[PDB]
Amino acid sequence: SLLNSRYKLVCYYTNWSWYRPGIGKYSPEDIDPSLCTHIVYGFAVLGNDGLMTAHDTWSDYDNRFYERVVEYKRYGIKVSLALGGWNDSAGDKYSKLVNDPAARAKFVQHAVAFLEKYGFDGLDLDWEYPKCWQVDCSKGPDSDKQGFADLVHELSAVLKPKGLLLSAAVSPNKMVIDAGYDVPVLARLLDWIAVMTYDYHGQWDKKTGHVAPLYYHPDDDTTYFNANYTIHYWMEKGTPASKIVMGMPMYGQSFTIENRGIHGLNIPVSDGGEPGEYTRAKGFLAYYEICDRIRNSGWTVVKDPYQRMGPYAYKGNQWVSFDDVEIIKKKVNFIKSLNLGGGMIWALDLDDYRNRCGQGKHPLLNAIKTELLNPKI
Numbered sequence: 001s002l003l004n005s006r007y008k009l010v011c012y013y014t015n016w017s018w019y020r021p022g023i024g025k026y027s028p029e030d031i032d033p034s035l036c037t038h039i040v041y042g043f044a045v046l047g048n049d050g051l052m053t054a055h056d057t058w059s060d061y062d063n064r065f066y067e068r069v070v071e072y073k074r075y076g077i078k079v080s081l082a083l084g085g086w087n088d089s090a091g092d093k094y095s096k097l098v099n100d101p102a103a104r105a106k107f108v109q110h111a112v113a114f115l116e117k118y119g120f121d122g123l124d125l126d127w128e129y130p131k132c133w134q135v136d137c138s139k140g141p142d143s144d145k146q147g148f149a150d151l152v153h154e155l156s157a158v159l160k161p162k163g164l165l166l167s168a169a170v171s172p173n174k175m176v177i178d179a180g181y182d183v184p185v186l187a188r189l190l191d192w193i194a195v196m197t198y199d200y201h202g203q204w205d206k207k208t209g210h211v212a213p214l215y216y217h218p219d220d221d222t223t224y225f226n227a228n229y230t231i232h233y234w235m236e237k238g239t240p241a242s243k244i245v246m247g248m249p250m251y252g253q254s255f256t257i258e259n260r261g262i263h264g265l266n267i268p269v270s271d272g273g274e275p276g277e278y279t280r281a282k283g284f285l286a287y288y289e290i291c292d293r294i295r296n297s298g299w300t301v302v303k304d305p306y307q308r309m310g311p312y313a314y315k316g317n318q319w320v321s322f323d324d325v326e327i328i329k330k331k332v333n334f335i336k337s338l339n340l341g342g343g344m345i346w347a348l349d350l351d352d353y354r355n356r357c358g359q360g361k362h363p364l365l366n367a368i369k370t371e372l373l374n375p376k377i
């Protein structure tokens with residue numbers, strides 16, 4: 001069992017996966033309690049009053065999604081509530097909060113009351129990102145860094161006496177890490193740091209790339225857009241290995257290629273890939289959408305024989321990069337070899353939890369669990 005192990009497996013639950021057709025529909029009761037040590041509920045949002053609030057009252061409150069996920073505490077799983085996320089990070093409201101000591105003080109007391117009201121074990125900060133709002137480092141003030149560190153301290157000061165957890169999902173990007181994070185402060189106060197070692201590449205690059213490279217590849221634009229650099233950089237900035245959980249994507253980044261007879265890495269891309277039937281987001285495909293394309297629609301899969309990155313797959317002018325079971329076992333062995341705190345997955349609802357692709361239920365998450373529980377490295 002993962003609960004008796006030395007590792008965390010932090011699983012992100014998303015409340016919007018309920019709004020998906022057919023087998024893509026995912027509910028709190030679909031969570032497999034044998035596959036996680038920690039569940040993080042995404043997302044609460046920052047209201048206009050500067051207070052944490054439910055993002056989707058119909059699911060979170062009226063259909064009791066908060067309660068139905070907090071239910072998993074009965075298994076010994078720690079259930080935290082995540083604040084923020086990509087969409088909620090678009091504007092300046094998180095920056096206005098952290099730069100205002102009075103606003104932080106009000107926010108912190110209300111947030112802790114919020115957590116205890118619904119029985120959450122902790123809070124997960126997912127501002128994307130301090131200073132570099134949605135990875136645009138020209139947008140936010142440098143004081144976002146000190147303000148975020150002060151917010152983490154003031155939260156920690158209230159949560160820790162109550163035995164509540166405080167964690168943060170953080171950028172894998174070296175420039176964002178430098179600009180937004182007071183790493184020694186965060187490393188000391190957070191119970192764990194979920195490094196989002198994915199989305200290194202996507203349609204915004206205007207060329208094909210892998211969503212989550214593990215190691216440097218000789219054709220890479222940079223030396224630091226890979227999980228190996230990112231994790232070592234967080235530790236170099238002062239993070240203990242035991243506080244790091246390494247994120248792994250349960251999805252792929254998809255691309256519409258120009259289709260000048262080529263389909264490898266770094267080829268020109270005109271747009272995100274066509275949206276999937278279930279996730280309905282251009283540039284994005286769940287793992288269970290990807291394996292159906294490979295198994296039943298004849299997409300061609302290219303693997304890296306050196307296992308520096310997961311596979312990619314293509315058909316026509318459509319191209320998607322993702323993690324399969326093989327690279328995931330390599331990544332978990334990477335986690336164990338560095339004695340990291342454990343792993344994190346985005347997200348529960350994107351793995352093949354229905355066994356639509358015939359490799360068993362939850363093939364990616366079961367591969368992580370199996371490798372984490374294997375003593376050999």
Ligand SMILES: O=C1c2cccc3cccc(c23)C(=O)N1CCCN1CCOCC1
Pocket residue numbers: 086134135199202204284346
């Ligand atoms: O990193 C970027 C990004 C970076 C730089 C420019 C962009 C322009 C448009 C869209 C994105 C970006 C973008 O969507 N992302 C992914 C963040 C959410 N990911 C988390 C898990 O699932 C969903 C994907």
Ligand SMILES: *[C@@H]1O[C@H](CO)[C@@H](O)[C@H](O)[C@H]1NC(C)=O
Pocket residue numbers: 215216228229232
């Ligand atoms: C991983 O990163 C470290 C430091 O950034 C580097 O020394 C090492 O060569 C990298 N490993 C691989 C396999 O690239």
